[PDB]
Design a protein around this ligand. Sequence first.
Ligand SMILES: C[As](C)(=O)[O-]
Ligand SMILES: C[As](C)(=O)[O-]
Ligand SMILES: [Zn+2]
Ligand SMILES: [Zn+2]
Ligand SMILES: [Zn+2]
Ligand SMILES: [Zn+2]
Lengths: 316, 312
Amino acid sequence: GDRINTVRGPITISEAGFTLTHEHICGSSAGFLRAWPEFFGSRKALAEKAVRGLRRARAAGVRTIVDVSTFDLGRDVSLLAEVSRAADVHIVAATGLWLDPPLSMRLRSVEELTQFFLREIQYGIEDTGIRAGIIKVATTGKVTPFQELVLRAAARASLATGVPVTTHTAASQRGGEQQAAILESEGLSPSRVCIGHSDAADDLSYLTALAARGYLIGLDSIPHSAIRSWQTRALLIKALIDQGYTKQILVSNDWLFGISSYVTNIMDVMDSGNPDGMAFIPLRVIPFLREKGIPQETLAGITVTNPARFLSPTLR
Amino acid sequence: DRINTVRGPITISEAGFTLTHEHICGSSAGFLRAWPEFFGSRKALAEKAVRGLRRARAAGVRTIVDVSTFDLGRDVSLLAEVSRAADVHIVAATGLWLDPPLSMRLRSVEELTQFFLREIQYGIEDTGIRAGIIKVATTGKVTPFQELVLRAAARASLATGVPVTTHTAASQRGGEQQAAILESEGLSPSRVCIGHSDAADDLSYLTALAARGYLIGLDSIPHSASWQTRALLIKALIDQGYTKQILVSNDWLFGISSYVTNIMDVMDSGNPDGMAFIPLRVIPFLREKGIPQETLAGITVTNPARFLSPTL
Ligand SMILES: C[As](C)(=O)[O-]
Ligand SMILES: C[As](C)(=O)[O-]
Ligand SMILES: [Zn+2]
Ligand SMILES: [Zn+2]
Ligand SMILES: [Zn+2]
Ligand SMILES: [Zn+2]
């Protein structure tokens, strides 16, 4: 407690400011940006596009992003440090595993995965020293055996360091419920867990029941509807406020500036559907919520206070 | 006239005794740099590799071909460090093995062709260290994505002259499906090694491929360590007239993360010779069976040189 690790070193919690808690510089695969940078035009072209997009978001009020790219999403932390410095936006890096682990991860025990997540939080990522400030885990269906090991290793690393856990779900399958059961079996407090992609939920009662248990609800992919409207997703934010669960809400774009882990040219399709990029939350969602009558203090709580509480390393 | 190595180009006569299917590390993309303590440390793995390569050099090896691809975790800076310190030539590979990430799996044949060309003609990552071989792995009857990898490999080989080497299940005669695809792209069989052929129960499968001009990779002899029975496949192909089609190797590794933990210790206990197994055990065994030294030198020196020299 008192400081959050970022790609340019520790910051105090008051420095984080407006924080987008689920974003990516680049959605890729381990080793890929280094082995084939011209897939993105060039490494310099991707960095320049990410710096302009982050400066765009900064001019709309954002001061920090949490890049929830794991090892297997190709998360290159040296790129994050470079674009963080050039944009003057803090970036929190992640450990954990997403949905494309290679064999060298897939064959590991829970104890081995715990030591890997442990290494990225406590020592540093690769040979850069940059330490992770969050653990990202993805699951599908009812949670596969390997995904259950990842959740348990994540809980273990969280309990030893205080850094929170954030998840990838299918809300339409109520996937947070299985995640929550596994993480609680490990002794992890719900207040150290964000159940992500909860904006895609059709069932408000699924979200209300997780919030009432203390989970953070990641309404984190609002503009993916702009490519069910985005205003319908944003109304889940108002619904949880009106139910008294403002403190449980985290809002983000889930944007990216380059994508190789999908069909070629998807980034162009996405950018034409959401030209605001990571500024979509502050330029479109926040004004929409204001016009629906949500007061300033509540919107500042969601965008500043809740991420600060969530990211502050806590064992209390 | 020259072959790319991790220390730059060398002339064909420099390659000498060549093991054409080996690995410094069997891992996954990004993994050695993200989690080097899995191997004790990066330094410990490099030290183990240098000890093993120096042992192979003392036994007569002068070059190895490291057929680790991107998705086997190939770390061509590690290869360069241990090539220099062992003073053993290492040829690096492009291509794809059996664990491509989404960023590779979702690519077209044209995109994959550009990636393999990038690693042969420009360099691997930002090291400028060019690949001298293309490695391709397939499973059953060849999946749709594996077929794209073979076609891109054939295209890259036709544009550069560098050869193609494969991973099969010899028990499934996988080289027949591989060869049909490669030939549909116009690739000469003389620029293809069908690997893991030592595991075959069917000599007919190997002789038919050799009769078409394929190189036969009898590359995993010490993994069976009977290894004697696998080595007699070398004699069988010699006796049928196919000496010039034979390539032999150990398929050894100095670290392994792409498998259950501690497999490396099991392997090192069964084969303490490591990469020196071929020169110290297989070559003398074949000589005792009456194969002339000149034939063994052709298999370990001339065939490798003919295969690696870029052609067309
Ligand atoms: C990289 As994603 C679509 O799971 O946020
Ligand atoms: C890395 As292998 C066992 O296919 O030679
Ligand atoms: Zn996700
Ligand atoms: Zn995401
Ligand atoms: Zn193989
Ligand atoms: Zn191999």
